[PDB]
Structure formats: structure tokens, C-alpha cells
Amino acid sequence: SLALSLTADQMVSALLDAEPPILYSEYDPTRPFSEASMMGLLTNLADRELVHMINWAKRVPGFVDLTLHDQVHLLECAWLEILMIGLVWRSMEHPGKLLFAPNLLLDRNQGKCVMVEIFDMLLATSSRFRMMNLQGEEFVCLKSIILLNSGVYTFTLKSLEEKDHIHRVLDKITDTLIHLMAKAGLTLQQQHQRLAQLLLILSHIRHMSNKGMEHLYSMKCKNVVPLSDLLLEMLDAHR
């Protein structure tokens, strides 16, 4: 297939072109908005983003090679992680704030709950990317890693073949990340250190996702914040 035969630069260009659009929220400064109002904006937003994410996923080298059931699983596992890293990425240039949408720029202050801890983790993560001067090329590699890796160990035989293919694609993306860093003039030691630094971040993103899914379940039970049929099904798979 194509994913294995792609060069580093081809992998990067393919990923950069597969990038989803930045959607707007329905935030309105003239409106009161509770704090279940902000969450309404975010869930509504995430719901709309999901369609574009599904689109982006099918253009992630190697993703289409998988069975629909495996693609479904990977997205169910990684969707919130993917939205979050996207959030942190576009929030880099906004220290102390999270840019959920071009028209929804929030600081840690504005009710929420104590949700605030997740907010701060996202702020910290974003702050991390900024100091590392995370590059767009690196970012798209990281995001595709999340997609292919998050649910890889929770999918028998021949299903084993699917896993191996995923590992290879991941390996290729690792080769691409190194390629980029080398291009940037980093020493080998610095490449290995940066690679590690980036991958360790993914551990925290997984953590933030997990915590997020819990709150999401809470919102469902409370039944005040509107959740799309898609978000509920996504939440269903996780539980």
C-alpha cells in the first residue's frame, strides 16, 4: 500500500493537506450563557468537528487499509484526544487561554467547576508545545500517532495482521518525526530527546481524554447539556 512507500516529506505533505478546518462556536457575547452554556458550545462544536475528523482520519496514511470495524474502534478511542491536541495546538500563541474556536477564547476563569483541572492541564500542555516551539509538521505527525495508537491494544488472528500494519505505519511516522527534527538542525541526541518529549506529552493527552470522558458521562446523566446522537454513541463505546 501507499503508507509504507511514502517518503518522510510525502508523509508530511499528505498529513498537512488532510488537516481539518477550524470551526466556529455559536458563542455570543450579548447572550448570558450559564456554564452549562459554555459546555453546550463545546459539545456542539465537538459534534461538528467530528465529521471533519472522520474525513481527516481516512486521509491518514494507512488508516483506510483497516477494516471499518477497526477504523470505528480507533476513532471511538481517540476522538477526544484528537480534539484536545488540536485545541492545545491552536492555543499556543494564547498563553493563559484556550482557543476552542476563533470566536471562543477562554481563560481559566469563568465558573466551570473544579473541569478547571482539565482546563489547566490543557493550558500546561499548550504551554509545553510553545516552549518546545512545536512545528506544524511535528503536530500533524503527533495527531496521526494518537489516532493509530490509542485503541491499538484494545481491538482472533488476522486481526493480528491489522495490528502489525499499524505498528509499521507508526514506525514510519516515527521516522518522519526524526526526519523533521534532523532537518531542523538538531543533533542526534537532541532528536531522540525531542522525540521522547513529544511522545511523553501524548501520555498526558491520554490522561486528559480519560478525565474528559468521565465528565462527559456526567453531563449525560445530568441531562442539562445537550449531547448529539454521535457524542452519546462515542461515549457509549468508551463504557
Binding site: 465529521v51 471499518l68 470495524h69 477504523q71 470505528v72 476513532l75 471511538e76 446522537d229 454521535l230 454513541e233
Partner: peptide
């Protein structure tokens, strides 16, 4: 079946 499954296969 699943919405995600539907959105994926098209």
C-alpha cells in the same frame, strides 16, 4: 448501525 460506522463508509 453506528453513526460513526455510517460516516466512515462513505
Amino acid at each position: 448501525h453506528k453513526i460513526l460506522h455510517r460516516l466512515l463508509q462513505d
